[PDB]
Design a protein around this ligand. Structure first.
Ligand code: K63
Ligand code: CL
Ligand code: MG
Ligand code: ZN
Length: 313
């Protein structure tokens, strides 16, 4: 337990900043996550042997898809770490524990296909889970992995704390369903503006955690431009294959997933930054001022997308 995980100097410093990229060395991503848990939560929050075994079963259960893979899991967990570390005093011991795990597990056993495509294919998961289809499956997958022998990192929690953390994680993971984002941010905006927002109201905490989850999930848009751009290529690798699969079912895909509408990528990013990303980080900055660097980074990458369109790159 006197076994403080460390990183090389450049990582030890940059990991603290919102725009840290976890880099291309797959084998360093568990260490980076353990570092983040130990700093965010303590060396005491999880039995190391159980946490490492959990991490490795989570990793095994992410597929080798272009975007919705283990690198995304660990990237989304890093963003949550940076929030939790810039707003240390706002969050319960159970929230700091649960949310880092929520993020790591939030896309477990993703197949590189949208809730839409599952429903149009008529996949058994769309019959088991009518809305937030993949999101309910990811939560299901997380509980299953916690139920494996030697995997229950929540072992030491009381019957109460255990049901609380699983409930934080369940709401956390459901909130990553972007179809639910729009409603949640409208409600948080109005509540903030009418001065009615109350972090003592569990229902309100839930909504705020929901926005954090969206903000971590979308955090490719707050990175250095070359990360933002090279992640977008991975994103279109999934979207276009899905469009191909839609076409095989006899269905015109939406332009966002039609590789024949490549030419319009810059404009679609602009719409997304305006419709989702900018409002998401704007509202998050309002409620959690120290998350301002996410908003500014997003605005910078909006501006790089504008430059693409103007053929200045
Ligand atoms: C949804 C999650 O995706 C992400 C996550 C992170 C960063 C970025 C993304 C991401 C992925 C794709 C887009 C996108 N690409 C297109 C490419 C061509 C095209 F014709 C249309 C679109 C397009 N449609 C615009 C919006 C419309 O017509 O409403 C969109 C949209 N939205 C924008 C952002
Ligand atoms: Cl598959
Ligand atoms: Mg997801
Ligand atoms: Zn995700």
């Amino acid at each position: 337990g006197l076994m403080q995980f460390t990183l090389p100097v450049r990582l030890c410093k940059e990991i603290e900043l919102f725009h840290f990229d976890i880099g291309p060395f797959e084998n360093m991503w568990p260490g980076i996550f353990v570092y983040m848990v130990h700093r965010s939560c303590g060396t005491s929050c999880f039995e190391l042997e159980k946490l490492c075994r959990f991490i490795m079963s989570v990793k095994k259960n992410y597929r080798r898809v272009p975007y919705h893979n283990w690198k995304h899991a660990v990237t989304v967990a890093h963003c949550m770490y940076a929030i939790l570390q810039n707003n240390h005093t706002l969050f319960t011991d159970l929230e700091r524990k649960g949310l880092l795990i929520a993020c790591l597990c939030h896309d477990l056993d993703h197949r590189g296909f949208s809730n839409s495509y599952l429903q149009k294919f008529d996949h058994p998961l769309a019959a088991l889970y009518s809305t937030s289809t993949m999101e309910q499956h990811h939560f299901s997958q997380t509980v299953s992995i916690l139920q494996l022998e030697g995997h229950n990192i929540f072992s030491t929690l009381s019957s109460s704390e255990y049901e609380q953390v699983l409930e934080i994680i369940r709401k956390a993971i459901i909130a990553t369903d972007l179809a639910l984002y729009f409603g949640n941010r409208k409600q948080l905006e109005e509540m903030y503006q009418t001065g009615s927002l109350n972090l003592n109201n569990q229902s309100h905490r839930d909504r705020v955690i929901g926005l954090m989850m969206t903000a971590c999930d979308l955090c490719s848009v707050t990175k250095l431009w070359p990360v933002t751009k090279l992640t977008a290529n991975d994103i279109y690798a999934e979207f276009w294959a899905e469009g191909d699969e839609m076409k095989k079912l006899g269905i015109q895909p939406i332009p966002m997933m039609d590789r024949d509408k490549k030419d319009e990528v810059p404009q679609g990013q602009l719409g997304f930054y305006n419709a989702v990303a900018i409002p998401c980080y704007t509202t998050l900055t309002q409620i959690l001022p120290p998350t301002e660097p996410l908003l500014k980074a997003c605005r910078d990458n909006l501006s790089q997308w504008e430059k693409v369109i103007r053929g200045e790159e």
